[PDB]
Amino acid sequence: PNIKIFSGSSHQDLSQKIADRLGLELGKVVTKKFSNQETCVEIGESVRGEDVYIVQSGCGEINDNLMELLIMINACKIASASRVTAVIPCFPYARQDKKDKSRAPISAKLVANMLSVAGADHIITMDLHASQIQGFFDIPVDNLYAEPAVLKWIRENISEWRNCTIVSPDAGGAKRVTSIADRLNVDFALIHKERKKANEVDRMVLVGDVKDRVAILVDDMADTCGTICHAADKLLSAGATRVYAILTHGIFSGPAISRINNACFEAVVVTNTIPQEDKMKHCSKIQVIDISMILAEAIRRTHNGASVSYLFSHVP
Amino acid sequence: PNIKIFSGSSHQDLSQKIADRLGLELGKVVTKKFSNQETCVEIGESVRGEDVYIVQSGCGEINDNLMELLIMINACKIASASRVTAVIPCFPYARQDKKDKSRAPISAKLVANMLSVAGADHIITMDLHASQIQGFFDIPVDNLYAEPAVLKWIRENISEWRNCTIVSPDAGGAKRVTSIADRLNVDFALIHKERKKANEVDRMVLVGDVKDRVAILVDDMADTCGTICHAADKLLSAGATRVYAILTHGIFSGPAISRINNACFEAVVVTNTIPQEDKMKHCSKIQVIDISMILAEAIRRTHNGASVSYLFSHVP
Amino acid sequence: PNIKIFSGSSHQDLSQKIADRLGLELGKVVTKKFSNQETCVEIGESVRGEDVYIVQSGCGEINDNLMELLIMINACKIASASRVTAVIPCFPYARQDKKDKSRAPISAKLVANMLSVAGADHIITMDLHASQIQGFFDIPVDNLYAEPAVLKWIRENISEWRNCTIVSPDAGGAKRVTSIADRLNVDFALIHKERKKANEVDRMVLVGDVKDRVAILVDDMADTCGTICHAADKLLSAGATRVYAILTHGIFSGPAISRINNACFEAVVVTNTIPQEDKMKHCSKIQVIDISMILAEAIRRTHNGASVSYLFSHVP
Amino acid sequence: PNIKIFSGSSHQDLSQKIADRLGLELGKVVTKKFSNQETCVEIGESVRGEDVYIVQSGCGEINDNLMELLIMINACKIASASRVTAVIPCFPYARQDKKDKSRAPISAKLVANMLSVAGADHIITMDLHASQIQGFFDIPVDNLYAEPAVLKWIRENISEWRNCTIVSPDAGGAKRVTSIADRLNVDFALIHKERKKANEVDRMVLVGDVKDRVAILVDDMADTCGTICHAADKLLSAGATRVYAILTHGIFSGPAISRINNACFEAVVVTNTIPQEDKMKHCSKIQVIDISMILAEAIRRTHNGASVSYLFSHVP
Amino acid sequence: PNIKIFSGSSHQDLSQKIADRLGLELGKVVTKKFSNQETCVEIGESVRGEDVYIVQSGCGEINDNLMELLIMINACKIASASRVTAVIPCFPYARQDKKDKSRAPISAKLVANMLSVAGADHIITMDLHASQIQGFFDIPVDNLYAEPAVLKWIRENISEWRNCTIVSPDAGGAKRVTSIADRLNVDFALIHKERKKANEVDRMVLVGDVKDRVAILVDDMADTCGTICHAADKLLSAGATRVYAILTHGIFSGPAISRINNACFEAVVVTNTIPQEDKMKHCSKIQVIDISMILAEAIRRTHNGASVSYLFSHVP
Amino acid sequence: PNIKIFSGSSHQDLSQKIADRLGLELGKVVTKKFSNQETCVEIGESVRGEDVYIVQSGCGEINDNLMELLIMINACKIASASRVTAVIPCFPYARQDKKDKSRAPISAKLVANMLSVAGADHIITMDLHASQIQGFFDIPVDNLYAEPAVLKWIRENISEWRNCTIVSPDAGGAKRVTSIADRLNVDFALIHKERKKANEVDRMVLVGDVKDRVAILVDDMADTCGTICHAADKLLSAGATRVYAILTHGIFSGPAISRINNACFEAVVVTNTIPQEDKMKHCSKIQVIDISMILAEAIRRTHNGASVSYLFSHVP
Ligand SMILES: Nc1ncnc2c1ncn2[C@@H]1O[C@H](COP(=O)(O)OP(=O)(O)O)[C@@H](O)[C@H]1O
Ligand SMILES: Nc1ncnc2c1ncn2[C@@H]1O[C@H](COP(=O)(O)OP(=O)(O)O)[C@@H](O)[C@H]1O
Ligand SMILES: Nc1ncnc2c1ncn2[C@@H]1O[C@H](COP(=O)(O)OP(=O)(O)O)[C@@H](O)[C@H]1O
Ligand SMILES: Nc1ncnc2c1ncn2[C@@H]1O[C@H](COP(=O)(O)OP(=O)(O)O)[C@@H](O)[C@H]1O
Ligand SMILES: Nc1ncnc2c1ncn2[C@@H]1O[C@H](COP(=O)(O)OP(=O)(O)O)[C@@H](O)[C@H]1O
Ligand SMILES: [Mg+2]
Ligand SMILES: [Mg+2]
Ligand SMILES: [Mg+2]
Ligand SMILES: [Mg+2]
Ligand SMILES: [Mg+2]
Ligand SMILES: [Mg+2]
Ligand SMILES: [Mg+2]
Ligand SMILES: [Mg+2]
Ligand SMILES: [Mg+2]
Ligand SMILES: [Mg+2]
Ligand SMILES: [Mg+2]
Ligand SMILES: [Mg+2]
């Protein structure tokens, strides 16, 4: 079997980068819409007995892209592909990973079941919102970390990183922030927005010392940037000299760009798990860490039957 | 268990009509989008041990609506509903019902598998593009006919219906047209657009006599109205006095409204399996047959454990 | 893995032809009946890690043959075959492909489920009664066409084929007839037997002109030959000079042979998806198109991981 | 839900007896064959939300009957039956319950999988050839014993039963014979036909004393009656005064009737799990124990949610 | 259907409390070991059509208890129970909820799959180590919180609770601690043990102010009490006046009792999701919050088809 | 793919013997217990695309070992092993192979389902208590016989084996004893312990002649040795000169060692499907037949795609 890399409509630049790093051309696929807005998928080459990797991030037109991915997976399976792997850099519906409300769906589990029934044999993803999403499948799920790439960026772009403090913008980010602070041998802090019992002012509590130090906000994603912007205001109010925000998934939906442009961030750093070209044109603060080498190495090692553990300590 | 009727975002007027005919209020659901365009479903009441019917047509934002339906089905199942029925008046991806091309997906089968894995126990639909789609599920699938409603409209709105000829706009509609012509005891004709071997003019062949008679075009759907418009030009060129078009699914995507407005149709008749309010505002030729009573009777009989065979001979 | 071709009891001559065209000997199998008429299957060689193809048509003792096929598939799967493919030239129960009656089974779907649970990984079949039967499986299903072979026979055996008209014996055959007429660039006609509302005479309506022309009846199968015989009487009554019947599946059950012998057919042409040796001995009108090369090429390309699209335009 | 009893073509007299004992009429079903010998099943009434019991023994046209049963189960499931139970008095392919030969199928497991995929929720059967066949399903399987009925017949029809010896015709029947001998407080013996190493005379070894005593052969089934006839010759050669044969499944296929008529049996006693009317007309030695009351009580208790343990100690 | 409560060997006192609160006697079960240490389960009453709840905590002989639970679930399913619910107060293998190491199993997912294949229809559990474990099943999973009971204990047993600080013993507990601190309107702190890069001294970093205040350690479980004991030493070194530890799962395996007896805890508070009678006899610091009313109310509401949302705000 | 042999904690000496006979080192696995007695499995090497064989007998801590095996299978599957085979020399819960009691579980079927859901693709086992357990899986199950090894031991260690009688200790062993007696061309006898109707003395009935002959007791297993010890007393009381006991599974749980030491056995012969080192230290009568060559040959032939039928006639 040979590696066949197919791109959905979501992140074709990332698919191209992965294919170039693998020394391959992208597989021939036409991914369009019928007139009635139904997804049209036209695989333009044989995948018989091939090791098919379909790159599709959960971003942009989320349901459009997920349906595109499912249809492409099913087409490859029925076309007798040896193995179909869904390379999903940003897993859609990952934040709907539990039922903590009455009648609430576990949409991440539904997406996992849909991918399984479409015929996916393997999932490659980066920085799942909850790592337990790996357990939502009965197939192997590669949950790659952007943490080695983040540490590289911090050590190369922040002069006073050895005296910085890594700040969690919410309680759920504490593990990620503590891991990064341990790897950098720096202090960490946590910011919590307390629960909205009524319609008074949202107030943020900070635990840890950030006074007269550079604060680096690290989180898994910035959707509306309410979390990071509120954390940035709190950090400046607490005496932080400079505030950075580093995310792996830059969703930047809704008012995020205006929020960042009016915030105090020295830089907002995201990976290219989601296309950022449009976002960077309206926000100069955004910088992008390319993770295409990580995904390409993961795909290559999966095809060659080699461990991907190397990707959790080094940036290829 | 009690009937709980929940509406998706696709066709809420039809859901309201069904609920009124059942003497029920629609179940409390908030069906919106998160900022990143992920589907948000918030069922606002208990469905524990309830007989849940979710009405969602395949129309409008097709993938949005299908994801909404799947998430609502899964939420109801995890919320311990006694039974979850997907009422899908127009089945999405129904035209992708076979693999007659290399690497082509069977998207209808994928949609069926997705509905099954979401937890649907029963499907109620009207005039499947292919009746074999019933076989795409392992659960009961009700394929209701709009044919009794069509015959009623013909007998009440076309004065010379006894001398009319029912015309198939393509080869695939022949069974539907022959059934309607048999029930009306009238002649039938078939129109075929021959295959596009090169870039010459599309030419249509008509088999059957339509000269100096009213021609009624009957088809399962009109998406772009290319089929019915080309058939209408052919029918007028063949000497038909007046031309009607009767569909059960009025999709009317893309250039359909301009095509119909510039066509020669006496009337374009569709059911309300798809919302038509917007379409009727720009095309006076469109008339709507309400099928909400058929769907409501089907839901009521399904809940009561009664046969729906009555719906195939009478309009309630 | 190597190709292993195993024959059921249904069509062993076709299995032999396929094996010869593949340059192989048929796999050693004893397919008999126990005393109590239970199917006895004794695979006489190892199939470990082999690519097993089991040839069994739906014909003759239908349930006997289907049980034989299921038992052989399961034996091969438990015997650790790398892949088990059911080569079913005529799919049994294919006409029971929908539920258009109360309490009616979808027997084609049940057969598909039985084949899936027996362990079939791939289905190769010719001219499914409904192409949507491909969607009854979750495994790849090859629906080969006899159409290229039919066109070859028409062009080589009917002198006036360029002025002929291809006739559908019922409404359901319209797509097949229009496709053949398009490929031959000839006229087409359709014959419909209207529905039996009471016990009066069956009357047939013909749409299209067949007067003073050769009429070629093309259908997917002739079971009792009531359809083709009634169509032939109608065609002669309408002024057809000569009438041919071309089918892909010659079932010829019940009174079919006497019907054909007393009909006006110039020739009844069938493929050898079903054994015809016995039928030809009692009806001189029957001629057979060998499709063993099509099936052998399909098996060879499936084993080699090559597209079978070539089989839809050429006869190997 | 109400009990609906449907009969297949195999044993309709037993179905009638069960229905009468349940105070019910048999459900309306037409079970015939299409012209091409495909099974035709036409359920003539609604089974929506009903507790459906389908009676079909593995006998006669075995594959015909099993396909009939599977099609009826699937039709009832798709017709929205509350529960479908297969009442299979003699389980087909039960003797193919293991793989003790190369490439041998486990046909009993395949039949179980086929019943499961057809949609059976419950199996009721009598005296499985191997009780482990219960483990071939993931649904409850009732393995009823004819042993209480056998003991009743022995105590009422054999005057010297207290001095009799119960004889196993092969090694596999030892458990059944020891159980019966324990319940009767009588001696037991075992007869073994040693393995056929070459083409010499089949010789039988008897362990136990049968001299000058009545010998009762007890086995689960008599297919060709080779086992019981050879055992009977051995028992007479060993000095048995009279020889009885008691089976629960009288298959009597092939040469069994001539074998019994030429044997020395005082009586051959079978249950009516298989129809015996034809067999009794050609062999006066055959007597029938009616087990319809056992099956009817099992069905009634299954419907009422009551234990069937009472059936293992008493004959209702 | 009626509620049937069955106890495994793990926590029979809790099962008794649940049954008493439900006004029921525990179902008759013998749960012992065969001589070869295989689990022996003997359900002593009919569960036909019953709503069966099996109470079995993951504690004590973990694999013994889990096998007991699986065997009891399967026995109830095969015994035709209407519904089988596994009441697992402490979910076993819950800490193995992801693959963050090469070749690491997701044992929680395996346990979920085993429960699903045993036939569980519903899971009721308290304070899952990861709430995403709900997504490891395709059945409803009730993840009850001990948080209302913890808050009650704090408000009734700690006089200076309004000036206390709730302390997370690790980064993963941050969400739980922030939720509790929000509900109490008190400060929170977090303690992190940094990663063991080499064999130097384990050092703990504290973020937040605990000086001259009562510190309440809140975590989901205390297995070896290394986390809470190290956190307690850090808290005293940081100037905390008194230190409490509140857990929901008191596992107290290995050296935990000696660790607590030599620690500085004012009280170690656990729920009775795990039996604590033996632990309290050797450690006077341990106090137990009874959660049997929460579990009993959850079971009762599940049986009655009522929401369990009330249990997340009130202690019944 | 390469053979990877992994050992569980149950029988590591047998795993070592298998690996040596295969010319391999055992795969690196740490199989320990967490503090709370949960099974900890740490596979120490890549199994990507490997043919993994996990050796784990059902013995010792039965539930511990079975959970270990399931966790290791699941870890290998998620670690992308090409194929995972469970080598289970003594199948746990094999004696719970049917439901012959009210509410009784079929624990063997549950174990099979658990192995299937863990991801096992193949099972290799020796002398299943019931061969129908092969039918409890949908994957190939190799049921190897120790019979060739037993016959070798008898012919090499019992001087008067040609005049011996092979004795079944119960009715269920009759097939095994008759097969062995046929292969040795010797007499056989059967011993039955009649059913315990009340609390009187257990009495044993012997059928067959053992007077003044060596008696060889052959059974599938000796758990408590009650069966073989009672049979030995009966055989001596019946005039047997010497009594041997040959088993394939020596469980020797509970009072078995004291029973054997106080019995009259010339030798108790078992295979090493279960570790016997501890048992032999307290009972000099126990001798061990090494079957590691049989298991190693089975694994090697499974990997090489060769028949294992040779193992049923010869000891490698
Ligand atoms: N150091 C690590 N940190 C986090 N996750 C890891 C780590 N090592 C492995 N994983 C997880 O395990 C998966 C597979 O691990 P890998 O080392 O590539 O080999 P294997 O597939 O045999 O376990 C990765 O995709 C990742 O999800
Ligand atoms: N006359 C008919 N024409 C077409 N389809 C039919 C007809 N009668 C029944 N069906 C199909 O069968 C389904 C169920 O049939 P119904 O008569 O309601 O009872 P049952 O569910 O017991 O079969 C319908 O939803 C429809 O798909
Ligand atoms: N005494 C028995 N001997 C043999 N099989 C039995 C016996 N009792 C029960 N069974 C088996 O168990 C099945 C169901 O048992 P039953 O006592 O009716 O209640 P439950 O279904 O709750 O176990 C029966 O159909 C039969 O297969
Ligand atoms: N306030 C809440 N906090 C956390 N989990 C909750 C909450 N409300 C509901 N849940 C979760 O949802 C499950 C079921 O919710 P419930 O309100 O009882 O009704 P429903 O089952 O219809 O959703 C609970 O068992 C729990 O896991
Ligand atoms: N002589 C035999 N006696 C008993 N069981 C056998 C015998 N031959 C084969 N089997 C069974 O069949 C299985 C596989 O058989 P084998 O001859 O190795 O080839 P195949 O897997 O192709 O059937 C064995 O593992 C065993 O369970
Ligand atoms: Mg979250
Ligand atoms: Mg967050
Ligand atoms: Mg179509
Ligand atoms: Mg069309
Ligand atoms: Mg048809
Ligand atoms: Mg036809
Ligand atoms: Mg047998
Ligand atoms: Mg026998
Ligand atoms: Mg954790
Ligand atoms: Mg922790
Ligand atoms: Mg047994
Ligand atoms: Mg025994």
Query: Concatenated DSSP letters for A285-301?
Result: TEEEE--HHHHHHHHHH
Burial label for C226, CB within 10 Å (0-12, 13-18, 19+), is middle
Distances (CA, A) of A280 to A269, D93, F279: 11, 70, 74
Nearest residue of E to residue D134, measured between CA atoms: E78
* DSSP letter string, C99-130: --STT---HHHHHHHHHHHHT--EEEEES-SS
Helix (H, G, I), strand (E, B) or coil at D275: coil
Closest approach atom of ligand 1 to CA F46? 22
Residue A269 CA to its chain's centroid (Å): 12
| Structure tokens belonging to residue D301 | 């208790």
Give the containing element (helix H, strand E) for F235.
Answer: helix F226-237
Test site for ligand 1: of F28, F43, F48, most ligand atoms within 8 A of the Cβ = F48
Cβ contacts of B270 on chain A, cutoff 8 Å: none
Q: Is A138 annotated as a binding residue?
A: yes
Distance (Å, whole) CA A276 – CA A260: 14
**B80·E140 Cβ contact <8 A:** yes
DSSP state, residue E171: G
Find the chain A residues whose C-beta atoms sit closer than 8 A to any C-beta of E.
97-100, 102, 106, 108-109, 112-113, 130-136, 138, 141, 143, 168, 171-172, 174-175, 177-179, 182, 187-190, 192, 194-195, 205, 207-208, 307, 309
F173, β-bridge pairs: none
Report the atom number in ligand 1 closest to the C-alpha of E104.
23
Backbone angles phi, psi at B245, to 5 degrees: -125, 125
Verify C-E touch: 3 or more CB pairs within 8 A.
no
CB neighbours of F258 closer than 8 A, spacing ≥ 6?
Answer: none
**D265 by DSSP, 3-state: which?**
strand
Q: Which residues of C touch B208 (CB under 8 A)?
A: 207-208
Q: Give the sign of the dihedral formed by CA D192, CA D194, CA D196, CA D202.
A: negative
Residue C69 amino acid letter:
L
Q: Which long-range contacts (C-beta less than 8 Å, at least 24 apart) are formed by F153-157? A: F153/F246, F153/F269, F153/F289, F154/F180, F154/F184, F154/F216, F154/F246, F155/F184, F157/F267, F157/F269
Residues in chain C whose Cβ is within 8 Å of chain F: 46, 48-49, 78-80
Chains A and B touch (3+ CB pairs under 8 A): yes
> Encoding tokens for residue F156?
């090499």
Closest residue in chain F to residue A123, using alpha carbons only? F78
Chains A and D touch (3+ CB pairs under 8 A): no
B233 is in an annotated binding site: no
Query: Residue D35 in 3-state DSSP?
Result: coil
Give the neighbours of chain A: at least 3 Cβ pairs within 8 Å: B, C, E, F
- For residues E195 and E193, what is the distance between their CA atoms, to the nearest angstrom? 7
Q: Which runs of consecutive H residues, i.e. helices, occur in chain B?
A: 12-21, 62-78, 107-118, 147-157, 174-184, 226-237, 256-261, 277-282, 292-304
User: Whose C-alpha lies nearest to ligand 2, atom 11?
Assistant: C100
Nearest CA to ligand 1 atom 14: E102
Contact D217, D231 (CB under 8 A): yes
- C-beta atoms of F140 and C49 within 8 A: no
Task: Choose one of D4, D29, D43, D48 to mutate for the ligand 2 pocket test, by most ligand atoms within 8 angstroms of C-beta.
Answer: D48
CA nearest to D47 within chain B: B305
Q: How many whole angstroms separate alpha carbon B293 and alpha carbon E190? A: 61
> Which tokens is D259 given?
């074998």
Beta-bridge mates of residue F166? F188, F216
User: Rounded to a whole number, what is the distance in Å from the CA of D140 to chain E's nearest CA?
Assistant: 5
How far away, in angstroms, is E225 Cα from ligand 1 center? 29
Q: Within a 10 A sphere around the Cβ of A88, how many other Cβ atoms?
A: 29
d(CA F7, CA F5): 7
The chains found to touch D (3+ Cβ pairs under 8 angstroms) are B, C, E, F
Number of helices (H), then strands (E), belonging to chain B: the values are 9, 14
Residue C99 in marked binding region: yes
Are F189 and F208 a contacting pair, CB within 8 Å? Answer: yes
Residue F230 marked as a ligand binder: no
- Cβ atoms of F99 and D134 within 8 Å: the answer is yes
Which residues of C lie inside 8 Å of A (Cβ-Cβ)? 122, 140, 302, 305-307
Closest residue by Cα to residue C250 from C263, C269, C264? C269
Measured distance CA(E206)–CA(E192) in Å, rounded? 6
Spatial contact of F69 and F56, defined as CB atoms under 8 Å apart: yes
Which residue's CA is the nearest one to ligand 5's atom 25?
Answer: F142
Decide if C48 and F122 are in contact by the 8 Å CB cutoff.
no
DSSP element (H, E) containing C203? none
Angle C275-C276-C282 (CA atoms, 0-180°, nearest 5)?
145
Residues D108/D94, Cβ–Cβ less than 8 Å:
yes
Residue nearest to atom 21 of ligand 4 (CA): B79
Q: What number of CA atoms fall less than 13 Å from residue B183's CA on the CB side?
A: 17
Q: Which residues from E are below 8 Å from F37, CB to CB?
A: 60-63, 253
Q: Do B78 and A45 touch (CB under 8 A)?
A: no
Q: Say which residue the tokens 């009306």 belong to.
A: B184
User: Which amino acid is located at D159 in the chain?
Assistant: S
End-to-end CA distance of chain C: 25
Contacts with D171 (C-beta within 8 Å, 6 or more apart), sequence order: D190, D192, F174, F175, F177, F178
Instruction: State the distance from the centre of ligand 4 to the C-alpha of E148, rounded, in angstroms.
Output: 14
Cβ neighbours of residue B112 closer than 8 Å, sequence gap 6 or more = B133, B136, B137, C135
Q: For residue E233, say whether it is annotated as part of any ligand binding site.
A: no
How far does F171 lie from chain E, in Å, by closest CA?
22
* Spatial contact of C250 and C276, defined as CB atoms under 8 Å apart: yes
Do the chains contact at B190 and C207, CB–CB below 8 Å?
Answer: yes
Strand partners, A196: none
* CA-to-CA separations, A270 to A142, A228, A280, A289, E108, in angstroms, rounded: 20, 13, 11, 6, 32
Q: Are A166 and A180 in contact (CB under 8 A)?
A: yes
User: How far, in Å, CA of A18 to CA of F75, rounded?
Assistant: 29
Round to whole Å and give the CA distance between C159 and C282.
Answer: 26
**Taking CB atoms and an 8 Å limit, are B46 and E122 in contact across chains?**
no
Resolution (A): 2.5
Residues of the binding site of D for Mg(2+): 127, 129, 138, 142
Residue of F nearest to C78 (CA): F140
CA distance C11 to C69: 12
Residues of E with CB under 8 A from a CB of B: 122, 140, 302, 305-307
Token couple for B278 = 């917007």
**In angstroms, rounded to a whole number, what is the distance separating the alpha carbons of residues C46 and C31?**
16
Determine the angle formed by the axes of helices D107-118 and D62-78, rounding to 10 degrees. 30
Cβ atoms of residues A289 and A153 within 8 Å: yes
| Order of strands across the sheet that contains C215-222 | C204-207, C187-193, C165-168, C215-222, C243-250, C265-271, C286-289
Asked if C48 lies within 8 A of F306 by C-beta distance, the reply is yes
Cα gap A88→A249, rounded to integer Å = 12
- Nearest CB among C99, C171, C307 relative to B175 is that of C171
Contact B171 C172 (CB under 8 A): no
Query: For residue E171, which ligand has an atom nearest its CA?
Result: 15
What 3-state class would DSSP assign to A261? helix
- With a Cβ cut-off of 6 Å, ligand 1 is lined by A 142-143, 307-309, 312; E 99-103; F 46, 48, 79-80
Contact assessment for residue B269 and residue B287, using Cβ atoms and an 8 Å cutoff: yes
Q: Is the dihedral of CA C281, C283, C287, C289 positive or negative?
A: negative
Please tell me the residue having the least CA distance from ligand 5 atom 4.
D100
Q: Any idea what DSSP says for residue F112? A: H
* Contact by Cβ (8 Å): B113, B95: no
The vertex-F123 CA angle with F117 and F127, nearest 5°, equals: 130
Q: Distance between CA A140 and CA E98 in Å, rounded?
A: 11
For E307, name the nearest residue in chain B, comparing CA atoms only. Answer: B46
Residues of D in contact with F187 (CB under 8 A): 205
Residues of F in contact with C46 (CB under 8 A): 305-307
Please check if B122 is assigned to a binding site.
Answer: no
> Is the dihedral angle over the CA atoms A293, A295, A296, A298 positive or is it negative?
positive
